[model samples]
Target chain A: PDYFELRHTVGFEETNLVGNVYYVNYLRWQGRCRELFLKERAPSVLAEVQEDLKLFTLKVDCEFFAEITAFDELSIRMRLSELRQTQLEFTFDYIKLGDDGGETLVARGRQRIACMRGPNTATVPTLIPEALAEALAPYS
Target chain B: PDYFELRHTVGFEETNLVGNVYYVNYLRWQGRCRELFLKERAPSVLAEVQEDLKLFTLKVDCEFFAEITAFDELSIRMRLSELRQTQLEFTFDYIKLGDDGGETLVARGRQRIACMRGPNTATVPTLIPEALAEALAPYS
Candidate 1:
C-alpha cells in the first residue's frame, strides 16, 4: 500500500518537564500527516472536501510504545487502511530516529472518518464524492 | 458505572480556521478529565503512581459526532471501563451543551494504559499498586 511520509523535529512546546512528549502529540501529528498527504497527492480534491463537503472523524485510536522528547527527529507516515463509499480508515505510524540512522517505533494511530455534507450537525453521512474517491484510490 | 463529569468551555485557541475544534482537542480533554478526576478523587494515589510507578498510555481512540467551536459549553465525563492488575481502560464522553441546557454528544473516546515501573525505556509492565487499584475500584 502507498503511504505518505513526513519528517519532523520535536518542538519544546510539545514536551513535558520530564522530557516526555505528551501523548496527545501523536494524534495531532496524524492529522498533520493527513493534511500534508492530501495537499501533496490531490490539492483540488482536498479543497473540495474541506470547503464543499466535510469529513467528520468518527473514531481514533493511538498506542504508545516509546516516549519521544524535544529535538528528536521523527518520521510520520499515514495511509488509508480501509475505504468505503461513506467512510474511510487511516493508520499512522510515528517513528523516532536515532543519530545512527536507527528507527524506533514510538507510537501508532488509527482513525475512522465519515463523509458529511458540511459542518451541520443534522447532516447525514453521504457517499464520498467520485472525485475524492478516485484521488484517494491511489493511496488505498 | 459511576462516572465523573466536568463542564468546560472550549477555548478559542483550540479551534481551527474552519470554526471547528481541532481534532486533537478531544484527546487533550480526556487527559484533563483524568487530571481532574485524580485531583478530586485520589490525589495521593495519583502522585505515587506517577512519581514512583509509571502509567504508559498504550492506546487511545476517539470518535466525533458534532462540530463545536470556541466558547461552546462542554460536559466531559470519564470512567474506568476496564481494570486489571497491570492495565486499565478509560472512556471519555464529550457532550456539548446548548443554551437550553440540552446535551448533545459531540465525541467519545477510549484509552488503554499499562502500568510500568518508571519512565525508563527499559521498564517492564508492572501490576497496579494496591493503593491505586483500590482507589480506582469505585469508578469501575
Candidate 2:
C-alpha cells in the first residue's frame, strides 16, 4: 500500500461522458502532484526555471492501469525513486478509496521526466538545488 | 482471437531516455492504423475528406498493457465495434507478436471518434454520404 496520502479531488470536468476520469487528465493531475511536491521542496522551481533557465519536460512516459470515474475521490501517494545528477524520477499511485476499497482498482500510473537546460543543448548530469535536494533526501 | 497481422517497425528515433516508446507516438501509429483500415474500406477517405468535410478524433483513450522498447516490431489491431449516424467507435489492441505464433503481449487500447464538418460542427446524422457510409459499414 502506498502510505503517503496527498489530498486531491476528481471532478466531473476532469472526467468523460461515461463518467470515467479521462486518462490524459489523470496524467495532468499526476503532474500537479509532482509540481506540488516540488513546491514543497523548492518553492522557487517555477521562477528559477521559467524565468532564469526556461526548462521544461524533455520527455515523459505515462502508463495507466484502470479506468477511473468522476464519482471517485482520489488520493495520490508519491515518492522520489531516484535522484540523479540532473533529474529526479518520481512514482505515483492513485487509489479510489470508497465505500469498498477494493471494489474498483481505479487507476495506477508511472512517469519519467528528464531535466533540460536550454532549448537545443544536450541535457547533462547536474546537482539538484541544495535546498530541494535536501528536502527529497528522505524519499531518495 | 482477432489475428490480424500488420507490419510496424519502431526506429531509434522512436524512443527516448526511458528506453520505451513515447506514449504520444503510440497514438500517432494508432491513427495510421485507423487510416489504413479506412483505406481498406473506402480508398476515398483520404481523398474525399479533403474535398468534402469529414470527421476527426473527437476523443481517444489508450491503455498501456506493458512497456515497449525502441526496436520492437508492434502489431496494431483495430476493430470497429459500432457506428452511429455519423460517428464510429473503434476498439484498438496493440501487441508485439512472437515470430513463432503467440507468446507476448505489449499493449492494448481503445479509441472513440465522431464526425466533424468543415465548420467544426457535428456532421448532422442526415448528411452522411451513402458511398462513404456503405464503405465503412463492412468494418462493423
Candidate 3:
C-alpha cells in the first residue's frame, strides 16, 4: 500500500530513432521522480535541511532487465533502504504496467546519498537529521 | 558556434540535509542537456530517425572529479566527436564555475550511441542510416 505511481504519456519526443523510449531518458526521469517524492512525501523532514545545503547523490547503481517501449505506462517503486548515522539510501524498482494490470520488470536501482554540510560551507555538524530518519523509518 | 546553455537552479527541494548539489543530480541534468541539444541543435536528424528507426547507446564511460555546492552553476561543454558507420559518439566535460569565473572540473564522459531500423524487440541491424550519417557529417 506504500507505493507511489507516476504516469506519463510517453511522447515521440522521449523516444530515440528506433521508436522506443531512450534508455538514458528513463534513468533521468526516475531520478526526477525520486527527488519529487522526497520533498512531497516527507516535507517536514526535507525542510529541516539548511535552507542552503542539500543532500547529494554519492552513487547510483542501475540494472536494466527489459526494454520499455514508447507510450508504455511506467511505475517506479522506491523504499527507504539503509539508516546509517550520516547517510541515507534508497532502492527503486521500475515496473511497466500492462493493459490488464500486469507489470513487467524494467529496471532496478540503488542510490546512496549524503549531506554536504561542513565548516567550509555551513559549519553544520555531520550527521543524519533525526526527523528525516523518523519520517523514512516506516519504509525502512 | 551554435550552442545554448541550460541551467538548473538548486532549490531547497533539490538538496538533502547537506548544502551541496547531489552528485547523481549532476549526471541526470547532463542527460537532460544532451537530449535538449539533440532536439534543438539537430532536429532534422531527429526527424529522419522515426522512419529509419536508428539510434542506440553503445557504451558510457565517465569519471567524477569534484562535488558541487548548492546554487553552483554547472556548465556542460559538449562536442560531437565522431559519427561511424554504425554509431555516433559524443564527448562532454562538466565544470562548476565560481563567481570569479574560476571553474573546477566536475566530471567528464563519453557515450557511444548506435543506430538500427525497427522496434525494440527487433534485433539490432548491422547497417547505418544514410540520413543520419549525413546529419552527423558536419560534426566530423
Candidate 4:
C-alpha cells in the first residue's frame, strides 16, 4: 500500500460547541495530510514560493462516518490515486485510535489538486512539475 | 428558487501565505451558512442542546472554480435541496461579488446532514425533529 500517514490528536480548537470535532476540521486534516505528503516527498514544491507555481484544490469530497471528540488520536492516511498532466487526486482515510488500541474509521475524503502558473487571481493551469510528479509516481 | 443567502467579507484569517483564501475556509463557510440557516429558521434546534438531538454532516462536495483573495465580498447561497426522514441535503453556491457589482461563480458545494439522537459517541439515526422539519418544509 503506497500510502502516507500523519498522526494527530484532536485539539479543542478543532471541536465545536457540540463537543465533537468541527466538520470543517476534517477538510483541514485532508489538506494537512496532503501537505505533509508533499513536504516529506518533495520539499521543493512547497519551499520555492518565488517560482510562482502553486497547487490549488479544485474539488473536494468528504464523507464523515462517525463522530470524533477532543484528545482522540487520529491516523490520517493519504494515497495518490490519480495523476494527470495538470491535476492530481489524493484519497484519504481518517482513522481514530481507541484507548484500548482499537481503530475506528472516522471519515473518508478525496481532493483534486490543480497546478497553476502565475498569480492567484490571474492564473492558468499548468502541468504537474517534474519534482511533484516524480514524488507521486510511486503512489499513483 | 427558495434560497438563503449570507454575505461575508474575506478576512486575513481566512487567507493563506499565497494571499488567496485558504481552501479549508470554503468548507468553514459552508458550515457557517448551514448554521445561520438553522439559527434564523429553527432556533430551537440549536438552542436546546440538552435535548441530545444533533445534526451531523454526513458528506460534503465542493468545487472551486476561481481563486478568492482577502477582502473579497462573497454571497453564499444555500438551498434545502432534499429532505428525508433522518437526512437532508443543502446545496450551496459561492458567488464572489466584484467591486463594480459583478458576480462571479467562484465555487459550488453540497452538504448532506444526518439527524442523530443520543450522545456523540453513541448515536442512532433519528427523524428530523418537528421544529426543524417545519422550518425546512417551505424551503425543501
Candidate 5:
C-alpha cells in the first residue's frame, strides 16, 4: 500500500499516427514516475549539491500487455522492489482507466539503479545516502 | 556484418544536469535506430495506407554498462535478431566513439515487436508485411 502513484492523461504528442501511444513513451512515463517518487519521498536527493551522489539506471525492462491510446487516463504505480547498500530496483505497473471506471493493466516495467558518486564520467559506486534511504523505507 | 548503423552526437537536450545521458534516452536511441532501419530498408511500410498495419512494441530490455556524456559521438548498431509471421526482434548495441577512433560498448538493448492490424484499440496480431520482410532479409 506504500506504492507511489502518479496520474497522467495521454497527450497528442505521445501518440503515433495511428493514435496508439508510442512505445518509448512508456519508458518516459517510467522516468516521470521515478522522478516524482524522489521528489515526494526523498527531496534531499534532488538538492543541487546532492547531485554529487545520484542514482543511475543500470538496466530497464518493460513488457506491454495492452495498447494505450491518446486521451486515455493512466494510473502509474511504482514501488521499491529491492534495496541494498549501493543498489536498488523499482517496479512499475501502468493501468489504464476506462470511462466506465474499468481498470486494465497496460504494461509492467522494472528498473535497476545503482548509487554513484563523483563526476558523471568518473562515477564510482557508492552507498545510498542515509536521508534518502530513510525516506524510502516506507516503500522499500 | 549486416548490422544497420546510425551515427549521432549526444545533445544537451538528451542529458541530465549531471551531463550523463538520461537512461530513457537509450530507449529513445533504440527507437531511432529501428525507425531508421525501416526507413532505409523498407520504405513501403511507411506508406499512409500501411498505417492499418503496424509494429507494436511488446517488450524492451536494455542494460547500461558505462556513462555517456554530452557531445559524445555514438555508433548505434542494430540488427534484426528474429523474424516471424507476426513478430520480430531487434537487438541494439550503443557504442561510444573516441576521438582516437576507439569504440566502447556503453549499452545493449533489445526490443520485441508484434505486428498488429486494424484500429489501435482492437488490433489483432498479423503477419509482417511482405515488403518489410523482404527488405529486412539482409539483417535478419
Candidate 6:
C-alpha cells in the first residue's frame, strides 16, 4: 500500500473535559493529511485546484475503535484505495504508539473524493485534469 | 419522522483557518445531539453506561452540502431511522437559520450505534439494556 504518515501532537484545545480527544479532531487530521499529500507531491496542484477544477469529499465514513487522550501523538496514514477518472477513495488509519513501543489503531475511515468544476452541487464533474491525475497516479 | 432539535452556537474554536466550520465539528455536534437525547430521556443512563455498557459508533457516514462559519447558530435535527435489539441508527440533518429566517441544510449524516459491553475490542456486544432501549422506544 502506498501511504504516508502525517504526524500530529494532540493539543489541549482538541480534547474535551473528559480528557479524551474529541472524535471530530480525527476528521480534521485526515484533512490535514490530504493537504500534506498534495503539498508534498504536487505543490502547484493544491493551489490551482479550486480555480481550475476541485476535488470535494462526496462522502466520508468512519469507524471508531479506540480513544486517545490529549498527550497522545498520532500518525494518520492515508492511502488511496480506488482511483478513477473523476473520483477517488482514501483509507485512513489513525494510529498511536503504545506504552510497550507498538502501534495502536485508534480509528479507521474511508472517504469518497469527487472531482467537480466547483464545490457546489450544480457543478457537474468534468474530466479530471491530466495534470492532477498524473500527479496522483503513482500513489494509486 | 420522530426527531429532536439539538441547538448549538458554532463556537469560534470550531472553525479552521479556511474560515468555514471544520468538518469534524459536525461529528462533535452529532455526538452532542446523542448525549442530549440520552440525558433528557434517561439521565442516569449516561453515567452508568461507561461502566455497565457502551454505545459505540460502529459507523458514521456524512455528506457535506453547504458550509457554515463561526457564530452561525445551528439546529441539528436527529431522528431514529432504524432500531434493532442491539443496534440503532440515527439520521442527522444540520440546519442553520438564514438571514431571511429560513433554514438551510448544511449537512446530512447517518450513524450506526452498537451496544457493547466495553469500549475496547475485548468486549463483545451484548443486547441493549432494557432501560435504555425502553427509553429510546418512543423516538424509534
TM-score of each: 0.88, 0.49, 0.61, 0.91, 0.92, 0.77
TM-score of chain A, predicted model 2, versus the true chain A, to 2 decimals:
0.75
Whole-model Cα lDDT of every candidate shown, in order: 0.80, 0.60, 0.64, 0.84, 0.84, 0.77
lDDT of 5 by residue, B1-140 (tens): 67889899999898877667887788878888887877888888888346677777889999999887789999999988988888999889898999998999999999998877776457688778888888877776
Candidate 1 on B1-140: residue-level lDDT in tens?
Answer: 47788778999898876677777887888888887877787777667664756767878888786788899999897888998878999988898889997989888888888877754667777877776676677777
- Per-residue lDDT tens digits for candidate 6, residues B1-140, read 36778989889888755445656678878988888888887777777675756656677889987656689978799888888888889999898977688998879999898877754447678887777777766676
Pick the TM-score winner: 5
Instruction: List RMSD in Å for every model shown.
Output: 2.5, 12.4, 6.0, 2.0, 1.9, 3.8
Please, what are the lDDT tens digits per residue for candidate 5 over residues A1-140? 77789899999789877667887788888889888877887778779335587677799999999877778899998888998889989999899999999989999999999888887656677888787788777775
- Report the Cα lDDT for candidate 3: 0.64
Q: Per-residue alpha-carbon lDDT of model 3 for B1-140, expressed as tens digits?
A: 32234565555656645444555555566677776766865666667565655655654544555555567677776667865667677776777777798878777766667666655467566555554454445555
Residue-by-residue lDDT tens digits, candidate 6, A45-72: 6676646455666788888887677778
The weakest ten consecutive residues by lDDT in model 4 chain A span A47-56
Higher-scoring candidate on TM-score, 1 or 5? 5
Q: What is the lDDT of residue A28 in candidate 6?
A: 79
Would you list the rank order by DockQ, best first? 5, 4, 1, 6, 3, 2
Off by over 4 Å in 3: A1-19, A22-32, A35-41, A50-53, A60-71, A81-83, A118-125, A137-140, B1-50, B58-91, B97-102, B108-112, B119-121, B127-140
Q: What is the TM-score of model 5 when looking only at chain B?
A: 0.90
For TM-score, candidate 1 versus 3, the one ahead is: 1
**TM-score-based ranking:** 5, 4, 1, 6, 3, 2
Write one digit per residue (lDDT tens) for candidate 2, span A1-140: 33335667778687644344545665566667776776766776656555324323433334444555665677787767777776666666676777665634455555545454443333443456666667766664
Better of 2 and 3 by DockQ: 3
DockQ of 6: 0.57
Sliding window of 10 residues with minimal summed lDDT for model 1 chain B: B45-54
